[PDB]
């Protein structure tokens, strides 16, 4: 699909980038390392993580375990073996696959043959250690940052707020946030181009190996094919490759200059979304950027002039007599009418124009940046709210100055702080993305099925796990989403009926909440209620238009002889609190570390 000219251009870009960085490539790993053993220990640990839970194991699994054990026994020898393989082995055992069934979207599961898997692991770990050590991946890349997805989201929000005079709508200042997915970003990486790219960043042998690993025979259920074109996500290291490829895309988007700014100078790089000066920050439209895992998040802060230019070029390019293009717009359907992005002929045009520009910026043969898989939010005079999704959140950022009346900041709202003044300059209301809700629902469904054999305790345990995942991941943001609440009640009742069905009872009187919510210590089940919550059920026809104050409470998971079962949500520290708190405690730690230094003691 790639035009050779395009490939050449890409090469030029990447070369230019590393040139600017003084990025010394990763060597082929010799016997030199003090870390070698340590590195090995990580990979093994990771691999072990699969096997610690499931006691009954397959033949392949058993083999893998054995290999791991031997590796522990003979570390140096194992390392040597790995090295030899890397030097030599460019044809591997074929990769079996299956589909894990998330009932929306079935996900492919690649299963590499254990011997190569160790190699993949070690190589991967080494690459990450070397890359991060050498500052390959610039701050702006999200998923790998050593910060939690909700944390990441929070940081993003903070960055947005802390932009210099970002919320002004006075001098025709117009912000636009561009969410889009790099469609099939891995699934159309050509090995030739990929190989050459890697040969920039690492010792060519490693590159050769990696390219040869993606080129495997993909057996599935009696049908095979040589995976001639398209990276396989399910190798261990493949993530690194994807990330590296992502860098290319990022560079294409931002160009050498803006990217250079975001990274900072090579010797002393920027922190996540900091800038060496204000001037530099203000210079470009593209004030912030982050590619969380094949989903870029370009934030533009246009002026009236610039915006006018953009609309002009686009509109002239792609005309329309009426408003017209307001339909076929990717709005945030979870939010309410006057909450989500209003459809102004101007602002919408700008948004669409912006998207067009971005599309033009990336070559089509490399990846699919289809409008359909792209949400563009806009902030302006006529658009006060500013929306996006990230890490499966939906976040409506609304600045304090634009709010008509700042009520008692509710729950599931992050008050963002301006770094200069230290005032609560903007709010960020939080919903859970529909997609995440769907995923959760699918999880529940999965739990439910394949439970005719399974015993009540195990079922409840699984459900407990599911619930704790759902909350502990996005805690605060559950308050808002009524659909999620519904799912929780519905799901929880379904689980209860799994027990109650199991006893062929399925009846209210004879399963008082004793049996369910009492822990496993007392003959209970240990079910964790996210149920006996009162579901906030406001006026459905009005609520669609604007956010209401919650007026009417529906009864969620009810019961006769209603003992007020506490929820789980009250016993998890909501994220904003966790993050302010984090800032405090880490500050304290820092201060005490300084004290220790001064005093010359072990803190």
């Amino acid at each position: 699909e790639i035009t050779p000219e395009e490939a050449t251009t890409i090469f030029s870009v990447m070369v230019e980038w590393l040139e600017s960085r003084s990025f010394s490539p990763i060597p082929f790993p010799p016997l030199t390392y003090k870390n070698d053993t340590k590195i090995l220990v990580l990979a093994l640990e990771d691999l072990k993580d699969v096997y610690a839970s499931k006691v009954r194991l397959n033949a392949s699994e058993r083999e893998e375990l054995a290999l791991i054990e031997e590796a522990y026994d003979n570390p140096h020898d194992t390392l040597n073996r790995i090295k030899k393989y890397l030097l030599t082995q460019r044809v591997f055992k074929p990769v079996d696959i299956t589909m894990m069934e998330n009932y929306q979207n079935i996900s492919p599961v690649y299963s590499v043959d254990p011997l190569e898997k160790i190699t993949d692991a070690y190589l991967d770990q080494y690459l990450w250690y070397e890359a991060d050590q050498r500052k390959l991946f610039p701050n702006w890349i999200k998923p790998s940052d050593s910060e939690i997805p909700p944390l990441l989201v929070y940081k993003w929000t903070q960055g947005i707020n802390n932009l210099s005079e970002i919320w002004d709508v006075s001098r025709g200042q117009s912000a636009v946030l561009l969410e889009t997915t790099l469609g099939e970003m891995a699934e159309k990486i050509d090995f030739t181009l990929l190989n050459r790219l890697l040969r920039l960043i690492v010792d060519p042998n490693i590159a050769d190996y990696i390219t040869a690993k993606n080129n495997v025979v993909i057996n599935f259920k009696d049908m095979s094919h040589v995976n001639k074109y398209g990276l396989i996500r399910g190798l261990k290291f493949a993530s690194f490759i994807f990330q590296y490829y992502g860098l290319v895309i990022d560079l294409l988007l931002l160009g050498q200059e803006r990217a250079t700014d975001l990274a900072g100078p090579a010797n002393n790089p920027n922190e996540f979304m900091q800038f060496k000066s204000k001037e530099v920050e203000k210079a470009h439209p593209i004030r912030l950027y982050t590619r969380y895992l094949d989903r870029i998040y370009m934030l533009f802060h246009f002026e009236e002039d610039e915006g006018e230019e953009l609309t002009d070029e686009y509109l002239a390019e792609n005309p329309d007599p009426n408003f017209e293009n307001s339909i076929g717009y990717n709005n945030r359907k979870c939010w309410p009418k006057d909450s989500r992005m209003r459809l102004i002929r101007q602002d919408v045009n700008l948004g669409r124009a912006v998207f067009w520009e971005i599309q033009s910026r990336v070559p089509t043969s490399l990846t699919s940046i289809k409008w359909e898989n792209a949400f563009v939010s806009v902030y302006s005079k006529n658009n006060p709210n500013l929306l996006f999704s990230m890490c499966g959140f939906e976040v409506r950022i609304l600045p304090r100055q634009r709010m008509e009346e700042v009520v008692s900041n509710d729950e599931g709202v992050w008050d963002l702080v301006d770094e200069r003044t230290k005032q609560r300059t903007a709010k960020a209301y939080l919903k859970v993305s529909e997609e995440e809700i769907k995923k959760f629902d699918s999880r529940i469904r999965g739990i439910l099925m394949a439970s005719g054999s399974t015993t009540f305790t195990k079922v409840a345990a699984k459900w407990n796990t599911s619930l704790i995942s759902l909350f502990t991941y996005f805690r605060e943001a559950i308050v808002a989403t009524e659909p999620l609440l519904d799912i929780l009640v519905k799901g929880e009742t379904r689980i209860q009926n799994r027990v109650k069905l199991g006893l062929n009872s399925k009846m209210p009187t004879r399963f008082p909440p004793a049996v369910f919510y009492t822990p496993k210590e007392l003959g209970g089940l240990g079910m964790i209620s996210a149920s006996h919550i009162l579901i906030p059920a406001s006026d459905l026809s009005w609520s669609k238009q604007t956010d209401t104050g919650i007026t009417h409470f529906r009864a969620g998971m009810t019961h006769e002889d209603e003992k007020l079962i506490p929820t789980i949500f009250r016993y998890i520290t909501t994220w904003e609190n966790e993050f302010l708190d984090s800032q405090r405690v880490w500050a304290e730690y820092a201060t005490k570390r300084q004290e220790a230094i001064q005093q010359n003691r072990r803190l």
């Binding site: 870009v13 979207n105 492919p108 294409l252 050498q256 520009e357 033009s360 070559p363």
Partner: peptide
């Protein structure tokens, strides 16, 4: 000025090859 500095500045009767079908597969795999 800022838009210059990029790298790129300016039916079939086969159920296995239908636009709907490929799209569907794209949707329901990841």
């Amino acid at each position: 000025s800022w838009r210059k500095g990029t790298a790129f500045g300016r039916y079939i009767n086969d159920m296995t090859k239908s636009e709907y079908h490929q799209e569907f597969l794209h949707k329901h795999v990841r």
